[PDB]
A paper describes a structure:
The [name] complex is a widely conserved regulator of peptidoglycan (PG) hydrolases. Instead, it functions as a transmembrane signal transduction system for activating PG hydrolases. Briefly, the ATPase activity by the cytoplasmic [name] powers the system through its ATP cycle, interacting with the transmembrane [name]. The signal is then transmitted from the cytosolic [name] to the two extracellular loops of [name] via conformational changes, and finally to the coiled-coil (CC) domain proteins.
Next, we used cryo-EM to determine the structure of the [name]-[name] complex. The final map achieved a resolution of 3.9 Å. This allowed us to construct a complete model of the complex between [name], [name], and [name]. The lip of [name], as well as its adjacent α1 region (residues 102-109) and α2 region (residues 129-148), bind directly to the ECD of [name], resulting in a buried surface area of ~1850 Å2. This binding involves three major interfaces that are dominated by extensive hydrophobic interactions, two of which involve a Phe cluster consisting of four phenylalanine residues (F61, F110, F113, and F122) from each of the two lower lobes of the ECD domains. In contrast, [name] is inserted into the ECD domain from the side at a ~116° tilt from the central axis, resulting in an inclined binding mode. When [name] binds, there is an asymmetric response from ECD domains; one ECD domain remains stationary while the other rotates significantly to tightly lock [name] underneath. After [name] recruitment, the two hook-like ECD domains become perpendicular to each other, along with the small loop and top region of TM helices, forming a joint cavity that locks [name] inside. In short, the mechanism of [name] binding involves a “match and fit” process, where one ECD matches and interacts with residues from α1, while the other ECD fits and rotates to lock α2 of [name] underneath. In the ATP-free state, the bound [name] was tilted at ~116°, with the NlpC/P60 domain being well-folded and grasped by the tweezers-like CCD domain and pro-rich linker that is specifically restrained by the N-terminal residues of α1.
Numbering used by the authors:
A (entry chain A): 1 to 227
B (entry chain D), D (entry chain C): 1 to 295
C (entry chain E): 45 to 228, 270 to 385
E (entry chain B): 1 to 225
């Protein structure tokens, strides 16, 4: 079938409430869907649930190609290779230059070494991420670490390009600038899961905004607002 | 095979934890060195056994009433026992000895005890050579109370208790080598708990890229594999420099006396494949299991 | 008439002297035994001292021998040796030298322990000899006491004696009515065969002379004619022999008389009792109802 | 303030590292045990040196007819013998030992004749020291057969050979002990590194709010002092068990050999104040400056 | 004596804009000043010049006691007892309770416990934690972890409360419960600082505003929104 998870409750005990109610959801492949969730309730565990780290204790999780619950030693990294993940931290590598930072995720998966040089100009200098790529990342500004962070996540055109708080510590004067970079991937039609809690930031586009209270889904509007 | 990337990623690990790369090699080298320093002790023990086993002579005393009366056995009572046990199977020559010559031969050996030992204390005897000194238990059991024999001295087996003094020190060296090994093996487990802390920023993204379970641990394993390489090399170099500095004033003294094995540098490198494989043995599987049980 | 307490105290100290002499016999035997055992224990101690001195010289020379480099353990021979052929010979002679030295030392230790035990035995023997000599002196002390009180009662008995008398007691002429007939048993026929010497025999103090008699003197002087010998102590004649009964009446027995065994007269029978009279007064024959207590009787 | 608060935190630092901090004890215990052993054998060799002669001596003797009488060297034989040997250039000087002083040194050199060993049993010696004790056997044979000399005695030339091997064993123990000691430093230096790595939060917490520098290192040094005391305690227990386990069986016969001196546990206890000094001050010093150039 | 800072041109590794061009500000008792600008302004080095975490290459630093440009290291923690700064990790010990954290926040200087505990519950329930101080912090919810560092920040006398990003990545509704908590102690009389970058909080109480863009004080007026 297709990308659909339902009846997923890991049932975390030793707590007042597990906040895992086995919610059945149905999401297609396409544009950007926003998960405007409150803090400490349904963000980290939900993001980890499709990240194939903590297995669900009830039901199973399905993706269009693979099975998440049913696996082996070789089934896990094939699922792990086809998903791109963007996080809050910049997580650069200080001991190496920038031009091979995006190439670092290519020799560890079994690609042809000379063929990387046929891919790195197609990936690095694609959309506004040209720069010079031959500087130390310590002396570089903070406004372009996230530009190569999302470049590391998109190197072989994967299916899911999920991002969690791209602005974060960034000022709102330049958050609209990096949003303009974010929507370029959304124009390509690839699946993206964008989860943040920022009022009057992503409310301009009025895309599919969802919310939950205590593990139970309470908002599902395809053109809703946050409030 | 991506060999040049593995060639130069290991240099950052050596540049990171510079205050432990020496200590790990020192403790493994010390742990393997005195463990290696006991097999050659056992070797020289068994080799010095052979240079005395070749010339052990059997000696059996006689009763006093057949020895105090006559020095030479010419009576038929001693001659019948003389001619019966002297050619059976494990004999090459039997030498009869008198009593009076068996008194002053000790005086010719040394001019001591010349006054404190009487004439009437040295029974007549025989000297018998045996083909195989290892099979001594036959004539131990072939000799019981017979009319003319008083006791059996059981050839010359005073050599085993002479050389038994070094078995205790070899056992002590092996025991303290064992306790140094049990105090050294857990450092290999400590390396993986200190090295993964130095590279937390890359192991997380290398986990979520889809890397192989069989290939995620090689940069955490090849340095522990090569750590056992130079450790046994400096261990045998230290063994060279302790043999060539503190034993020439001891072992060379027994050379002209021709009493020891006289080992050298050649047989030391003969046992090196039996120790370098043991050195790389526990460095591998322990490091493999401690990453599987922690990471 | 009244010369009776003097006679009783004269015979009492006489029998006491007799019993003291009887104790003196085993007294001299005891010090003879002490003297002969003191001859033996000192000779044994002298032999023990001689062999101890011999073994002391023996350990002196073997203590000296080690001082001239007498290395006798055996493992140290590898330092002296320079050939394997010499080393095995050195250990072979070492095994017999160490054995002989050990036997010499153990023999000296055992002989020294035995000599110390024999010296303790000689000390106990010396204590026994000193105790025996002291006991011999103690039983000589009462002996010399009896020798001291010997002549005192002799003077008292001789003060009365035959004197202090009138002619009326001399006019009282009485040799004795009738002596006994004795065992005519049959081994004692000669007791009254010489009785003509009695009936008129004067008294003597502790004497068996033919003419001078006492209570036990008549007894042994008659019984040596029969060939039977008894101790000259009439108090102990009540303690010698089997206790004969009062019911059976056979002659030749003895009989305690004059109260508490102060006169062990022979058995007379026939309602008469021939008892020893005082000094000068002839041996009278008066019945058993003259003294009072008679006590038991023995067989000679 | 007082010690009533800080007793919890030493338990927490031990509980968070129950595997790394137990390697801390025993690798120091080996380093102090080898150094304790070296002092022991050096003291034993210096004690047993007094039994034998020096490096230039020839123990000669005299006959009984001149020794039991005329104790001072007064007779014609002694004056002639004490003048003939100094004429040629072979000897340095002659001493004077007679039966007055031949008893007290004998019981000293042989402490088993406290019984009645008698008097006038040891002959006069008058021992002689010489220049060259290398070609002296001809001198010994020349004094043999003299009318008045019983025999000679020489205790050199591979007789005092054990002093060529005991010092070598002590030097080998020192050589491995120094390498173990320098290996210990580069392991105890990582104590503060792993402690700062595992407890990075609170060490920043009193830093910004204002605390004395002198109180910051107090919850780190006491672990190293306690580990040092544990190491020296298990080390001094280690000598106690390793002697009485099987080293007594190889030394008990030496007293009947009377080749070595007398050793008991009190001699090992005599050196323990010197062993407890090292280990707790060197560790305190190397734990002091590693934080001055860290924070 | 109305102590402030000025000049400071700290170039160090790469000059670019060395610290600040010049500083012409003043302090006040009960003040509350915002700051607005991009990430490249070096505002983190501004606050590090205040608690003597960075020695000025020119000028001097002095907060109401002495010129701290030249002072011994023993006297560096002498003045730190009245300064409170708040962060995003909140510095929480999972092995210690809330009252254990508040006790550890004042135990380090060394005092008799007969007067320490007499003022603990006066400030425990003041912030909004009425009891439940013997609970593990992971069992405590995320809506009050920021309040624990505030509660342990007033164990000594409030003089300067430095604040750089107190809310972080948080819902805007649950930032309203803490924006009045420092206002309550601002009514006590102590001054307090503030460092954010959003503009929604700027037009709320209309306090002092300073801007910074690469070491340059672009606009500052100490009035209005």
């Amino acid at each position: 079938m297709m990308i659909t998870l339902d009846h997923v409750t890991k049932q975390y005990k030793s707590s007042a409430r597990p906040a895992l109610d086995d919610i059945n959801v149905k999401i297609d492949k396409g544009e950007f869907v926003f998960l405007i969730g409150p803090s400490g309730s349904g963000k980290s565990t939900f993001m980890r649930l499709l990240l194939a780290a903590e297995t669900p204790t009830s039901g199973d999780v399905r993706v269009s190609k693979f099975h998440v619950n049913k696996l082996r030693g070789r089934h896990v990294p094939k699922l792990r290779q086809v998903i791109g993940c963007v996080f809050q931290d910049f997580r650069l590598l200080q001991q190496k230059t920038v031009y091979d930072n995006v190439a670092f995720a290519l020799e560890v998966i079994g690609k042809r070494t000379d063929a990387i040089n046929r891919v790195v100009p197609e990936v690095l200098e694609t959309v506004g991420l040209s720069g010079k790529a031959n500087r130390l990342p310590d002396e570089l500004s903070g406004g372009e670490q996230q530009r190569v962070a999302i470049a590391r996540a998109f190197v072989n055109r994967p299916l899911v390009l999920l991002a969690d708080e791209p602005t974060g510590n960034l000022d709102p004067e330049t958050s609209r600038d990096i949003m303009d970079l974010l929507e370029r991937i959304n124009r390509t039609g690839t699946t993206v899961l964008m989860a943040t809690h920022d009022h009057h930031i992503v409310d301009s586009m009025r895309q599919r905004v969802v919310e939950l209270s205590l593990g139970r889904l309470v908002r599902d509007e395809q053109r809703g607002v946050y409030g | 095979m991506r060999f040049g990337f593995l060639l130069n990623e290991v240099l950052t690990g050596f540049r990171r934890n510079v205050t432990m790369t020496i200590a790990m090699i020192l403790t493994t080298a010390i742990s393997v060195g005195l463990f290696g320093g006991g097999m050659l002790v056992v070797r020289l023990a068994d080799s010095s056994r052979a240079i005395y086993l070749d010339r052990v002579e059997s000696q059996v005393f006689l009763t006093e009433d057949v020895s105090a009366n006559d020095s030479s056995c010419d009576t038929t009572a001693c001659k019948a026992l003389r001619e019966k046990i002297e050619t059976r199977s494990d004999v090459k020559a039997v030498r009869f000895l008198n009593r009076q010559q068996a008194y002053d031969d000790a005086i010719r050996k040394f001019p001591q005890f010349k006054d404190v030992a009487g004439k009437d204390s040295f029974p007549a005897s025989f000297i018998v050579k045996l083909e195989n000194p290892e099979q001594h238990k036959d004539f131990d059991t072939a000799m019981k109370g017979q009319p003319g024999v008083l006791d059996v001295l059981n050839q010359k087996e005073l050599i085993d208790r002479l050389f038994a003094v070094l078995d205790g020190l070899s056992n002590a060296a092996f025991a303290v080598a064992l306790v140094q090994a049990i105090g050294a093996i857990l450092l290999i487990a400590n390396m993986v708990q200190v090295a993964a802390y130095t590279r937390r920023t890359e192991i997380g993204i290398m986990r979520l890229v889809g890397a192989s379970r069989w290939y995620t641990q090689l940069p955490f394993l090849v340095e522990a594999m090569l750590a056992a390489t130079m450790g046994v090399g400096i261990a045998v170099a230290g063994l060279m420099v302790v043999r060539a500095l503190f034993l020439e004033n001891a072992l060379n003294q027994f050379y002209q006396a021709n009493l020891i094995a006289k080992v050298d540098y050649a047989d030391i490198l003969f046992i090196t494949p039996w120790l370098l494989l043991l050195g790389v043995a526990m460095s591998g599987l322990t490091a493999y299991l401690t990453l599987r049980l922690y990471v | 008439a009244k010369l009776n307490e003097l006679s009783r105290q004269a015979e009492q100290t006489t029998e006491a002297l007799h019993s003291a002499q009887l104790d003196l016999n085993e007294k001299l035997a005891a010090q003879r035994a002490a003297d002969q055992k003191l001859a033996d224990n000192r000779t044994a101690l002298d032999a023990a001292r001689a062999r101890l001195a011999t073994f002391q010289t023996a350990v002196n020379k073997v203590a000296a021998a080690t001082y001239m480099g007498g290395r006798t353990h055996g493992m140290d021979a590898i330092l002296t040796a320079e050939s394997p052929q010499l080393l095995i010979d050195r250990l072979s002679v070492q095994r017999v030298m160490a054995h002989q030295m050990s036997t010499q030392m153990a023999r000296f230790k055992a002989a020294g322990e035995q000599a110390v035990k024999a010296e303790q035995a000689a000390a106990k023997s010396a204590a026994d000899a000193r105790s025996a000599a002291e006991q011999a002196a103690a039983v000589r002390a009462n002996l010399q006491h009896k020798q001291s009180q010997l002549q005192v009662q002799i003077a008292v008995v001789k003060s009365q004696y035959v004197a202090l008398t009138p002619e009326e007691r001399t006019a009282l002429a009485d040799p004795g009515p009738v002596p006994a007939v004795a065992a005519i048993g049959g081994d004692r026929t000669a007791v009254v065969q010489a009785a003509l010497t009695q009936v008129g025999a004067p008294y003597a103090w502790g004497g068996a002379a033919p003419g001078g008699f006492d209570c036990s003197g008549l007894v042994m002087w008659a019984f040596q004619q029969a060939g039977i010998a008894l101790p000259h102590s009439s108090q102990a004649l009540a303690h010698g022999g089997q206790p004969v009964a009062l019911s059976d009446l056979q002659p030749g027995d003895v009989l305690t008389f004059y109260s508490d065994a102060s006169h062990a007269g022979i058995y007379i029978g026939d309602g008469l009792m021939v008892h020893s009279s005082t000094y000068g007064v002839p041996v009278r024959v008066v019945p058993m109802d003259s003294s009072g207590p008679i006590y038991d009787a023995r067989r000679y």
